[PDB]
Amino acid sequence: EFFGESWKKHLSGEFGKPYFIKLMGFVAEERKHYTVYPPPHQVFTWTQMCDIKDVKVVILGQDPYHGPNQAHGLCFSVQRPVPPPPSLENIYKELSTDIEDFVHPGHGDLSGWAKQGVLLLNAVLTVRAHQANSHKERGWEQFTDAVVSWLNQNSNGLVFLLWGSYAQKKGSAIDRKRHHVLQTAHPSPLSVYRGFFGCRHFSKTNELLQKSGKKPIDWKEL
Ligand SMILES: O=C(O)c1cccc(CNCCCO/N=C/c2cc(=O)[nH]c(=O)[nH]2)c1
């Protein structure tokens, strides 16, 4: 019901593996005793926005937002009327200088990017309310590794945006000739001035996409 068919076709090889069944049991048990984000129907939103064949750009995240109403299955995104968190505000700030006509959309919902084939993938897909990293190393990492590996092996000329050391390690094995990799600091306030501000990843992405024979992302389409 909640897992997009084209993604299911290519990823379902994971589902019967011991780690996956165990993971499913862990999350189900957590939901019985705690509030877990995102809601069940939004754990796999990243599979719902575009066909797997139509992925053009991959932005790798770590943990889902752990505050009420924030996480909805796309890394960095928050649905209306939730205010964009500090990392997202910094993303928008960089966009405002990198993409000339980009102006703050007045909301944090990145669905418009996802629909264009910008994959917004967290490494860990659930979290206990108010407890950052609470579902770390429970099986999600292996599953999302499987996703990244599939894209690496089966797609062509993808642009991977790797922000922060965690994302960079996750993307370390990507074929740098088949795909394009851009790396910089995490857009969090604590690290944003260590490279993210002035990285110009968004304009650069579109240049690389043209070199891959592909039409650019409209970063304003939100
Ligand atoms: O907002 C401010 O004023 C502010 C000030 C100082 C420092 C920071 C911290 N800057 C890193 C923020 C990182 O944000 N994390 C978002 C995230 C969401 C997600 O779904 N997956 C992630 O991996 N990461 C923010």
UniProtKB/Swiss-Prot annotation:
Q: Please give one Gene Ontology molecular function term for this protein.
A: ribosomal small subunit binding
Residues reported in the UniProt entry to bind uracil: Q62, F76, N122, H186
Family of this protein: Belongs to the uracil-DNA glycosylase (UDG) superfamily. UNG family.
Keywords assigned: Acetylation, Disease variant, DNA damage, DNA repair, Host-virus interaction, Hydrolase, Mitochondrion, Nucleus, Phosphoprotein
Entry EC number(s): 3.2.2.27
Spell out the protein name for this chain: Uracil-DNA glycosylase
Q: State the top-level EC class.
A: hydrolase
Impact upon substituting Y65 to A/C/S: Acquires thymine-DNA glycosylase activity
The record names the disease as: Immunodeficiency with hyper-IgM 5: A rare immunodeficiency syndrome characterized by normal or elevated serum IgM levels with absence of IgG, IgA, and IgE. It results in a profound susceptibility to bacterial infections.
